[PDB]
Design a protein around this ligand. Sequence first.
Ligand SMILES: Nc1ncnc2c1ncn2[C@@H]1O[C@H](COP(=O)(O)OP(=O)(O)OP(=O)(O)O)[C@@H](O)[C@H]1O
Ligand SMILES: Nc1ncnc2c1ncn2[C@@H]1O[C@H](COP(=O)(O)OP(=O)(O)O)[C@@H](O)[C@H]1O
Ligand SMILES: NCCC[C@@H](N)C(=O)NCCCC[C@H](N)C(=O)O
Ligand SMILES: [Mg+2]
Ligand SMILES: [Mg+2]
Length: 344
Amino acid sequence: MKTICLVGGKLQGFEAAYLSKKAGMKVVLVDKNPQALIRNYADEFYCFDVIKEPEKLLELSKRVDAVLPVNENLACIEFLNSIKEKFSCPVLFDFEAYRISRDKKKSKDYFKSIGVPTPQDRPSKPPYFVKARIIYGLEPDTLVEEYVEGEVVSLEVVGDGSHFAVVKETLVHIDETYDCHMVTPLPANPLFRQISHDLAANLPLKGIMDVEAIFGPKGLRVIEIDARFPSQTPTVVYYSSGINLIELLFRAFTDGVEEIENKYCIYEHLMFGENGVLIPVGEQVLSMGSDYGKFYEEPGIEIFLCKGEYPVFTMVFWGKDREETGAKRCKGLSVLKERFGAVL
Ligand SMILES: Nc1ncnc2c1ncn2[C@@H]1O[C@H](COP(=O)(O)OP(=O)(O)OP(=O)(O)O)[C@@H](O)[C@H]1O
Ligand SMILES: Nc1ncnc2c1ncn2[C@@H]1O[C@H](COP(=O)(O)OP(=O)(O)O)[C@@H](O)[C@H]1O
Ligand SMILES: NCCC[C@@H](N)C(=O)NCCCC[C@H](N)C(=O)O
Ligand SMILES: [Mg+2]
Ligand SMILES: [Mg+2]
């Protein structure tokens, strides 16, 4: 049995914990927040700030198989970079790739440098997209791009520095706030796969990255990369393709990775609002919760409950095809109806 240490216990931390458990690993969580969202989901919880007390994390490294940063606190990531040679196990992160991916303008310069199409900068006609809002005087540093209509599509890539494993396409379902409330799998797209390969190869990526593109009216446009363990999509990747991104990332830092199921999966967040009206919500709502863990499971159905000001449910449905998965979704909703008096 292997043991993984997660630095960060919110949304990324949940995803990494969830897949670590699927792989049969013990999950050790480090988080500075004593009320960290997934404190009760992890197998062990150590409450400290890694920047203030590095020796405690270094000591943990002696007794786990890997340390995975799962936060986007720049102070934390940059400090971890500065002490990474002192660790007694792999640190499953690409610090140079993160320095590029975190900065949207630097990412766009990177895309252009390798000929990857991306939305036009500072356009002259509306609509504009600004970063998240559509516009029909902001800080001098705001990204202004053309608004590209169409499907938002995600691909994860795991690299070992030499080989780049492009995994599974997913559809990012967006709400009125441009947050993601649902994820479903998509058929292979040879163009998007090659672009994602090249984005990883040219870094060169040793670690994990996701690539998001919009399938626009004038073709595919890459909108961002994020070189950190994602939320939401890895669960859909797991059921639809059989690949566990935690296992693949761990392999990239041990024996290496090789290039290249066909099930369906529906993943979504639902809030139980005023007098049990069921409302779709984005990730951002879930991150304001106080406690997050497993609520229910049967064949083809997992439900997680995120407690707080109005309970939020994360629903995971799978099956051999769209039809069987739709059937499980209906069953999962009725589990909420008969139990709680929920409407949808
Ligand atoms: N130096 C650190 N040591 C330990 N845990 C940390 C550190 N920095 C961040 N974290 C934890 O990682 C989790 C995710 O942090 P992140 O900054 O990515 O998300 P956030 O939504 O901006 O959270 P916050 O409310 O802290 O701003 C949080 O639970 C946070 O407490
Ligand atoms: N240029 C664009 N044109 C149209 N929609 C966009 C554009 N950029 C972003 N979006 C929309 O805004 C959402 C969030 O943008 P994203 O670049 O993915 O930010 P983040 O780094 O915050 O996740 C996207 O999922 C997409 O729905
Ligand atoms: N592959 C497409 C994924 C986009 C979105 N699902 C995401 O990963 N968001 C991560 C937000 C995490 C915020 C914060 N660092 C936290 O961990 O809570
Ligand atoms: Mg994005
Ligand atoms: Mg992003």
